[PDB]
């Protein structure tokens, strides 16, 4: 168990209207109170990017934290099937956890 990572695609409509802003969201749950720091590293088709924004930790019913990082994406990039990777680091993790998502597969 310990911290877990989930990655979500942009809202379909956001990717279809240039006026909208599509974002890929990385959620980390069960982050402990003893080791609350979480580091996020994002990559697009393998290229690390730094425009991701982290949300303030949120206390959960089970006395752990939920930490979310949001990455704005280029409409074109997503529609073309570029791959988005979120790598999560935390003291309680023997190694960083990484998830990948794209319009073609996701998960």
From Swiss-Prot:
Residue ranges, annotated region (CH2): 1-105
Top-rank lineage group of the source organism: Eukaryota
Glycosylation positions in this chain: 62
Post-translational note: Glycosylation on Asn-62 is required for interaction with Fc receptors and ability to activate the complement pathway. (Microbial infection) Deglycosylation on Asn-62 by S.pyogenes EndoS or Endos2 endoglucosidases prevents interaction between immunoglobulin-gamma (IgG) and Fc receptors, impairing ability to activate the complement pathway.
Disulfide bond positions: 26-86
Complex and partners: Immunoglobulins are composed of two identical heavy chains and two identical light chains; disulfide-linked. Interacts with FCGR1A; this interaction mediates IgG effector functions on monocytes. Interacts with FCGR2A and FCGR3A.
Protein name, per record: Immunoglobulin heavy constant gamma 1
Span of the entire protein shown here: 119 to 225 of 399
